[PDB]
Design a protein around this ligand. Structure first.
Ligand SMILES: CN(C)C1=CCC2=C(c3ccc(N4C(=O)C=CC4=O)cc3C(=O)O)c3ccc(N(C)C)cc3OC2=C1
Ligand SMILES: Nc1ncnc2c1ncn2[C@@H]1O[C@H](COP(=O)(O)OP(=O)(O)NP(=O)(O)O)[C@@H](O)[C@H]1O
Ligand SMILES: [Ca+2]
Ligand SMILES: [Ca+2]
Ligand SMILES: [Ca+2]
Ligand SMILES: [Ca+2]
Length: 354
């Protein structure tokens, strides 16, 4: 049985090809004395320096990444890597040298029998059942617009916004102080992330939503805290994710996700634009907000030609679309020759991965 490992800036998603969802999901964090991995590392902040080996989707520290992979195989999945072909995912615009190092580590450190590396955005597109379209992938640390034509991600048109879930959680923590609530500790941040994932949503029209929240309490929702106290949240529910469309909310000069989507499409050949407009696919935990698809549909329509057919696809399981795409691909045993085997690695070296 093949294994699928999707390493993100904030979370590692791992499992067996064929499963409908990852069996293991843990924080992409490594702790080193002043080593531990995941929840275990976070728990020991202070006595351990924390390291996030994956920044903006790109691996930046190989020794820490090695620890993460070891943890995935031996502690989380509890499998013998030498017995399973392994599919790994990589961020858009990942340097070739990185792909080579990843391959060298899998064969020489973990001794896998075979492996394959796929681009995350492409896997998310496959998860929606298509090979052409533009993916909006927003996770914990980075957001990308990735146009894909017949399985090929067009590098020159990929857009990147260094704003994601982590920043949204921090922002919600900040604005919740306005109502007098104070969330500051690590434990408190965990509560805020839960509030964000349960009560936040994207307004179809921000200004009108603010007006509705100010003229009524129809948008207010209550939330019980660990101590038994109950708080009320109003416009904070939609102000938090609005940051995706208005990065200036958290002090970023970058254009919003709707604008980057449009700019991405305009960087592509005019003859395939129609296909991208009709196939806008959302992927990643930060695209889970109710209302985001309707908002993107409205914003893109405003930017696109009047006779352009616009369609946004937001799969219910998009929180794990990347992993799911990998599960699908890795489970196609008929194409087993696509796997890069150890033997092929011996004769051709790391460069065979490209
Ligand atoms: C199991 N495993 C590991 C695997 C890998 C891969 C694959 C692929 C392919 C094939 C080819 C290519 N390519 C490109 O792209 C370039 C060159 C080549 O070859 C790509 C691809 C993906 O990824 O999808 C594919 C395609 C198509 C299909 N169909 C059914 C129709 C399937 C598959 O499967 C697979 C599997
Ligand atoms: N229902 C939800 N509503 C809002 N945010 C959510 C929800 N579920 C998960 N998230 C956020 O999504 C992020 C996790 O998404 P994920 O796609 O796994 O990112 P990643 O792969 O770790 N990192 P990245 O490198 O940025 O793609 C966290 O910031 C979560 O809080
Ligand atoms: Ca990701
Ligand atoms: Ca600034
Ligand atoms: Ca042309
Ligand atoms: Ca092969």
């Amino acid at each position: 049985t093949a294994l699928v490992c999707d390493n993100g800036s904030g979370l590692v998603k791992a499992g067996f090809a064929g499963d409908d969802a990852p069996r293991a999901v843990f924080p992409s964090i490594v702790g080193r004395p002043r080593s531990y991995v995941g929840d275990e590392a976070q728990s020991k902040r202070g006595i351990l320096t924390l390291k996030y080996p994956i920044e903006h989707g790109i691996i930046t520290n190989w020794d820490d990444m090695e620890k993460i992979w070891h943890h995935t195989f031996y502690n989380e999945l509890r499998v013998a890597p030498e017995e399973h072909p392994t599919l790994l995912t990589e961020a858009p615009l990942n340097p070739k040298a990185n792909r080579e190092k990843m391959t060298q580590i899998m064969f020489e450190t973990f001794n896998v029998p075979a492996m394959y590396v796929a681009i995350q955005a492409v896997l998310s597109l496959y998860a929606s059942g298509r090979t052409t379209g533009i993916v909006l992938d927003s996770g914990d640390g980075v957001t990308h617009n990735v146009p894909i034509y017949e399985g090929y991600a067009l590098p020159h048109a990929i857009m990147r916004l260094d704003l994601a879930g982590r920043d949204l959680t921090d922002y919600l923590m900040k604005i919740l102080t306005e109502r007098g609530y104070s969330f500051v500790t690590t434990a408190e941040r965990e509560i805020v992330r839960d509030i964000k994932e349960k009560l936040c949503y994207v307004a179809l029209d921000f200004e009108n939503e603010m007006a509705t929240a100010a003229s009524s309490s129809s948008l207010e929702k209550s939330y019980e805290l660990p101590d038994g106290q109950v708080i009320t949240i109003g416009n904070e529910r939609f102000r938090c994710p609005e940051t995706l469309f208005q990065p200036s909310f958290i002090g970023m000069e970058s254009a919003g996700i709707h604008e980057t989507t449009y700019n991405s499409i305009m960087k592509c050949d005019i003859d395939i634009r129609k296909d991208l407009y009709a196939n806008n696919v959302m992927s990643g935990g930060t695209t889970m907000y109710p209302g985001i698809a309707d908002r993107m549909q409205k914003e893109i329509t405003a930017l696109a030609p009047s006779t352009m057919k616009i369609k946004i696809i937001a799969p219910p399981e998009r929180k794990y679309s990347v992993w799911i795409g990998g599960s699908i691909l890795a489970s196609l045993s008929t194409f087993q020759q696509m796997w890069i085997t150890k033997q092929e690695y011996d004769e051709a070296g790391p460069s065979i991965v490209h």
